Every structure is written in C-alpha cells, then in structure tokens.
Amino acid sequence: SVKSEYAEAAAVGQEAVAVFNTMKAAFQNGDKEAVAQYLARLASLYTRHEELLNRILEKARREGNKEAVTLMNEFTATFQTGKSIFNAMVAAFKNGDDDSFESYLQALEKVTAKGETLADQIAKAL
Ligand SMILES: O=C(O)c1ccc(Cl)cc1
Structure with a gap:
C-alpha cells in the first residue's frame, strides 16, 4: 500500500544518511x-x-487524502532544497573549492534534519 511504499522510501532516506556520513x-x-x-x-x-x-504523493492525491497531500507537498519542497544544495556541493567538489564543500555539507545536514519531524507526520497520515 501507500504505507509500505513509504517505509521503502524511509529506508532509502536512511541509506542516504549512512552514505553521507561515510562521505x-x-x-x-x-x-x-x-x-x-x-x-x-x-x-x-x-x-x-x-x-x-x-509516487506516494500522486497516490495520496488520487486517494483524496488531503492531509497527506499537504504534508507531502511541504516535505517534497524541503527535499528539493536539500537536492539543490547537494548539486551545489557536487559542483564545489568538481571545482576544488573545499571552503564551499564544507559549508554545503553543513547546510545540507541542517536542511535534512529539519525535514525529519514532518517525516513522522506523513507516516501517521497515509
Ligand atoms: O534521499 C535523501 O533523503 C538524501 C539523499 C542524498 C543526500 Cl546527500 C541526502 C539525503
């Protein structure tokens, strides 16, 4: 269901945390x-x-699950912010700018953590 697909998404998020920290x-x-x-x-x-x-967002929409749709819209916007910073970080790495890489590493952490207390609201809403 949407909920099994959310646990799979949560596990991939956790795989990112692990790999990010070893990176x-x-x-x-x-x-x-x-x-x-x-x-x-x-x-x-x-x-x-x-x-x-x-897929979870589209599924929640088709299911008329208004609260889930609100929370997913907010979560994906924040997710995209982290992605945009990640891309900037990758560019800092290609350019040899370590000052910016370190900074982005930190901002990407703060943006990912902030989006966590909401991740546990979606779970209960789906
Ligand atoms: O998918 C995520 O949650 C995610 C993916 C990649 C990075 Cl670097 C950080 C977070």
Missing part, C-alpha cells in the same frame, strides 16, 4: 577518490528517493 568522513580525511564514488552513490539515492516520493 563526510572521507572528505575530512582527504580521500577525494572515495568522496567521488560516494557522491555518485548519493546522486542515485536522491533520484530513487525522489521517485518513491512522487
């Missing part, structure tokens, strides 16, 4: 080769999560 570690340690591979992994995760999120 941050590699960045701090200077292992650019690893960072490069982690950024590719995280790109695919974002893409996969965004597709699971769109």
Whole structure:
C-alpha cells in the first residue's frame, strides 16, 4: 500500500544518511577518490528517493487524502532544497573549492534534519 511504499522510501532516506556520513568522513580525511564514488552513490539515492516520493504523493492525491497531500507537498519542497544544495556541493567538489564543500555539507545536514519531524507526520497520515 501507500504505507509500505513509504517505509521503502524511509529506508532509502536512511541509506542516504549512512552514505553521507561515510562521505563526510572521507572528505575530512582527504580521500577525494572515495568522496567521488560516494557522491555518485548519493546522486542515485536522491533520484530513487525522489521517485518513491512522487509516487506516494500522486497516490495520496488520487486517494483524496488531503492531509497527506499537504504534508507531502511541504516535505517534497524541503527535499528539493536539500537536492539543490547537494548539486551545489557536487559542483564545489568538481571545482576544488573545499571552503564551499564544507559549508554545503553543513547546510545540507541542517536542511535534512529539519525535514525529519514532518517525516513522522506523513507516516501517521497515509
Ligand atoms: O534521499 C535523501 O533523503 C538524501 C539523499 C542524498 C543526500 Cl546527500 C541526502 C539525503
């Protein structure tokens, strides 16, 4: 159901957290080769999560689930903010700008955490 599809989306989000934290570690340690591979992994995760999120949103819409639609619209907007910062980070990595990479790493953390207390409102609304 929409709810099993949400637990699958939540698990991909958790896969991103795990990989992001091992990417941050590699960045701090200077292992650019690893960072490069982690950024590719995280790109695919974002893409996969965004597709699971769109299917959940469209499903909630077809189901007339107004509250779920409101919360999903708010969550995906925030999700997109994190994606846009991620893309800026990838660009900082290609350009050799470590000052910006570190900054984006931090802002992407704060934007992802903020979107968490809502993630547990969607779950109960679907
Ligand atoms: O899909 C997510 O939740 C997600 C994906 C990628 C990053 Cl870097 C951070 C969060």
